Scaffold this motif. Structure first.
Motif, mmCIF file in Angstrom:
data_model
loop_
_atom_site.group_PDB
_atom_site.id
_atom_site.type_symbol
_atom_site.label_atom_id
_atom_site.label_comp_id
_atom_site.label_asym_id
_atom_site.label_seq_id
_atom_site.Cartn_x
_atom_site.Cartn_y
_atom_site.Cartn_z
ATOM 1 N N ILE A 1 0.832 -1.200 0.042
ATOM 2 C CA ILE A 1 -0.160 -0.149 -0.135
ATOM 3 C C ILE A 1 0.970 1.257 -0.086
ATOM 4 N N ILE A 3 1.096 5.240 -0.604
ATOM 5 C CA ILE A 3 -0.010 6.485 -0.621
ATOM 6 C C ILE A 3 0.687 7.774 -1.232
ATOM 7 N N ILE A 6 -0.532 9.175 -4.243
ATOM 8 C CA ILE A 6 -1.962 9.656 -4.388
ATOM 9 C C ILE A 6 -1.882 10.949 -3.040
ATOM 10 N N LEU A 7 -0.708 11.084 -2.566
ATOM 11 C CA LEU A 7 -0.275 12.347 -1.804
ATOM 12 C C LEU A 7 0.346 13.374 -2.723
ATOM 13 N N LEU A 10 -2.249 15.500 -4.273
ATOM 14 C CA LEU A 10 -3.161 16.420 -3.435
ATOM 15 C C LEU A 10 -2.425 17.582 -3.234
ATOM 16 N N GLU A 13 -3.176 20.562 -6.786
ATOM 17 C CA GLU A 13 -4.428 21.021 -6.895
ATOM 18 C C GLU A 13 -4.873 22.142 -5.878
#
Lengths: 34, 424, 423, 431
Positions: A1, A3, A6-7, A10, A13
């Motif tokens: 996993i 992240i 995906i961070l 973040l 944006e």
């Protein structure tokens, strides 16, 4: 996993320090090469 | 039981003959014995706007309170104070306090408008900043007192009432009390440090304020408390945020040691500045060393369950829950300071934004472990707290990788109800 | 002073080697110590809803809390807990509570949405039903806990100030307190009863909630207390509503028997279920006796006045003393229900008719006192109760009793309240 | 620790066989010990209106509370009271309180509307004058009690609570609290070892809390007089968070100021009740601190704030005071009386009809003595000490005379700041 990718979306944006690190790197390479 | 005069983070003489009288986030004041008299120094941590000086005592001062505007001294037997402003334009003044038989002065305060002298029978004398008296009030006996910009924090005590704080705010003319004598959760005490407990029996080392306006108190349990939601009358909680019996045990390699101690000065945004005194005697000595730092950690670790995993290394399955609490607590002290009074420096919004980014991210180290052991109900309720919406669809891609397919439906059921909320 | 791990309605060992741990309306626990481990015996009162299971205690669990949903155990010294629902689908998880040097775990509690553990340095650790924490907090040391659907009761006692409750509620948004450490009107105590005080020094037998949301506590004072209007901080007052020692002297009919000890279980809007313990021990033993129920009664009777009344000859009380109790019981029990129907909604549906039963009995209990007020030929004793009646049909019946007593001036005073009451 | 029953300003037996029970502005009542019975004597102060009568005590009515409407009695072992009003407008009925094993009754109360009896474990049993019970309520143990027309004022004590007062009000059909169980700033009698030989042991064996008398004001604000020999006063009790305990008087100063710097201990102070600003007293002068038969005349005494120093009056030589000290005491003593009186008007109104006139007479002398500081401060050339005094002047006419003080100080820079305060009143006053 994982992240971190995906961070990494973040938050979304030439630099004058990086020129001085290249002048200091090109100066040390000068004095020792034949 | 006896009363002793209290000053923030003072220290006793010992076998030596020079001690500090106060020590806070502006400067430290030291004194030196001349057998007949005393030589008092007022040295500062800031350099720019202030100068240091020194002068000669002929009365024997042992109480002070050093802050930005002035420097209020005191005398514990004759009832004699003196107020020395840092500015050269305004002059000093001197007043002698009425005392009855068998009475002392415990602690003083130097608010920018008022000057408070609280004695050991309960009297509460309030002057103005030039020497005109305003009131005399009778309360419980006072054993500590401090102040910031306009507010005043105090600790009452009796031989039968018990510990009680009180948190008021003498403004221009507004005297809105907030808590008047509510009880306080702290443990009083019951050797090389027997010289300390004769000096301060109450056990409070040094109470102070934060840089954002939140009261703290460093008990003799070595556990820095903090007060939250104090603008509300019925929501005040005392959140402990640091154990000095635990941060030392980590840094000593999983070992009991009796050499490093903790002496606090002030608090910052999330760091505590500390004088790490090393030795038997738990007060610092002269000269004053450099103030180190130390971070805050919520006390959720186990002294035994780390040792079975073998400086001390923590597994991520235990470190994940601590960062869940710590960004949860720090948000409630930041989201109200903007809403009620506002921000001082201006950069308060971006640290608020990056604190939410640590909140949802630290939950996902735990949310993935809940799907790893085939648990749908435990991992369901965790997805109701992510106020960040961009991590909601991020959790769905972790749901498919663990193959709990009914759980994938439930998260999308959460997204729609929070989607229709916004349209109204 | 020593801090001991209190459990609700828990009894010590004594000379025997089997004892109880809990008791409430849904179940109870007995434990027997075998040669090497402990044998916890969960055993219910209701059989129509659930099933008994029992197994071996690997650590020596001595704290417990049994509710309608599940159970919760824990070791006070080491600090390891266990949460086992009665359903088989949900799991039983085991978490270890962090402790310090020289610290116990005083009491535990289990809500259908939360789980609380309170230690003896003041920490107030709050979980959910799966094992995710919410906060760690610092208050005064705790000796007892009690929960219901949304609201938690606590009892604090420092080594300095102490004896103060704090009635909180765990809201879904923010914990909004109602009483933050107000002082407790209860009395600490001043051989078979030796080991009861070496096991529970406070002498608190059982604290709980009602079934209409009002807290109670039964301590070593042998008197049932009850908190009225707990929501409003202006008029929150304690109303002591049952003497346990005076109902024993009332049933015996003039005999003071000092081997009948009372043990309360729960409250059901009128009645108190009890264990009529007979013996040198004030606590019951194996096997558990049947539930016994007592109608509630005010402590408004005199020992000596009932003695000289029942000197010629159950206790026969005169009507002059009888309607005094019935007035107050209609006065306390009226106000407790009206705010609950106004704020919590109906639960049983027939609540509005019960108020007519008390308000009906409110009139008659004054009227037997109303004739008790005027029969001593004193005019001043009777006229105030003409205000204290509620209904208008009562004041219509209050004018016919004043005519037969030959008081023409008291007739017009009851008429003057009607000009106040018609407007 | 042992409890003891209580009565307002009641002396013990001492060594003789007659003593008083209560003492207030109505009258003093006293008993005489018949060897087997007791003999109560109820004496008043106003003889033209009501009349001295008396009877025989067969039960030991040692608890009493006398007011304008009736005169309650009580025995602290039987729990038997009897309400005997002054005139023949009511009967004398008797109701017996149920007592338990070891219980006592410590105090009673007598209001025009209700009757309150509290026991020694907190059963706050409420009656009325018409004799019906209302509610048996459970609070902390009670060692003191007093009341006025609706309100009640109590003092609780325990071994596990400490001193705590309670100010509530019995309304019409509901009882509301204001300060329920707030803690109390009063000294307890720190009885040392030498007091077991003193003449005052029998007082302290009679009353361990040392509260000699508690009472209300003439306007309705609570007071107390403990073993500290100071008269405390509670203010602003209607606001639940801004209560203040102001010691308006110290007896230990008026002994030393009136004896001419003597540390004589042969005179004492005993309070009866409080007037508007002066305090009625009984000046006992002897080895016993309690008054004895026949009691001296009720003398008056003016109140003084405690801002005087013992040492600084010694170089100033009845001890005389300078004008450099007398303005500052008068500034404070007129400041708190201008705070109590106003809130009684804007909540209740006039109670005797003359309240505005004594109000405006006080704010003038407040503003008059405030000038004495202004003339001393301008002669010491501390012009910022002068500016801080300016904002307090309530009337606009106080600002007008202060301009004429500045011109004799030769400070043309200071006077500019004062006139800009004057016009700044004009903008806000139009809003």
């Amino acid at each position: 996993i994982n992240i971190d990718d995906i961070l990494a979306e973040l938050d979304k944006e030439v630099s004058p320090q990086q020129d001085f690190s290249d002048l200091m790197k090109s100066w040390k390479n000068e004095r020792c090469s034949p | 039981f006896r009363y002793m005069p209290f000053s923030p983070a003072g220290t006793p003489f010992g076998f030596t003959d020079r001690r500090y009288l106060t020590m806070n986030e502006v400067g430290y004041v030291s004194t030196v014995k001349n057998s007949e008299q005393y030589s008092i120094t007022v040295s500062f941590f800031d350099v720019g706007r202030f100068r240091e000086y020194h002068f000669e005592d002929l009365f024997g001062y042992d109480l002070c309170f050093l802050n930005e505007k002035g420097t209020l001294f005191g005398q514990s037997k004759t009832g004699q104070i003196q107020y020395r402003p840092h500015d050269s334009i305004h002059s000093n003044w001197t007043k002698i306090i009425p005392l009855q038989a068998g009475e002392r002065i415990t602690s003083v305060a130097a608010t920018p408008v008022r000057v408070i002298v609280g004695t050991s029978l309960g009297y509460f004398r309030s002057f103005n900043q030039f020497g005109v008296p305003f009131a005399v009030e009778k309360t419980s006996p006072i054993v500590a007192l401090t102040a910031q910009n306009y507010r005043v924090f105090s600790v009452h005590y009796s031989q039968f009432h018990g510990l009680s704080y009180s948190l008021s705010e003498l403004g221009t003319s507004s005297k809105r009390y907030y808590k008047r004598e509510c009880p306080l959760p702290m443990s009083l005490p019951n050797d090389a440090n027997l010289d300390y407990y004769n000096f301060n029996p109450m056990g409070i080392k040094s109470l102070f304020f934060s840089s954002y306006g939140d009261p703290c108190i460093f008990g003799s349990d070595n556990t820095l408390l903090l007060l939250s939601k104090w603008r509300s009358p019925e929501e005040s909680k005392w959140l402990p945020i640091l154990d000095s019996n635990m941060e030392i045990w980590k840094m000593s390699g999983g070992k009991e040691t009796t050499d490093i101690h903790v002496w606090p000065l002030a608090l910052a945004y999330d760091t505590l500045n500390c004088i790490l005194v090393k030795g038997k005697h738990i007060w610092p000595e002269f000269p004053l060393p450099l103030p180190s730092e130390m971070e805050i950690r919520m006390p959720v670790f186990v002294k035994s369950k780390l040792l079975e995993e073998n400086e001390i290394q923590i597994p991520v399955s235990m470190a994940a829950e601590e960062e869940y609490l710590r960004s949860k607590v720090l948000s409630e002290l930041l989201t109200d300071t903007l809403e009620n009074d506002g921000e001082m420096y201006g950069n308060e919004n971006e640290v608020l934004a990056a604190l939410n980014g640590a909140y949802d991210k630290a939950l996902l180290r735990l949310f993935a472990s809940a799907c790893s052991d085939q648990n749908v109900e435990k991992a369901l309720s965790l997805a109701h707290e992510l106020k960040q919406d961009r991590a909601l669809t991020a959790a769905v891609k972790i749901s498919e990788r663990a193959e709990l397919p009914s759980l994938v439906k439930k998260i999308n059921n959460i997204r729609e109800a929070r989607y229709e909320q916004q349209l109204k």
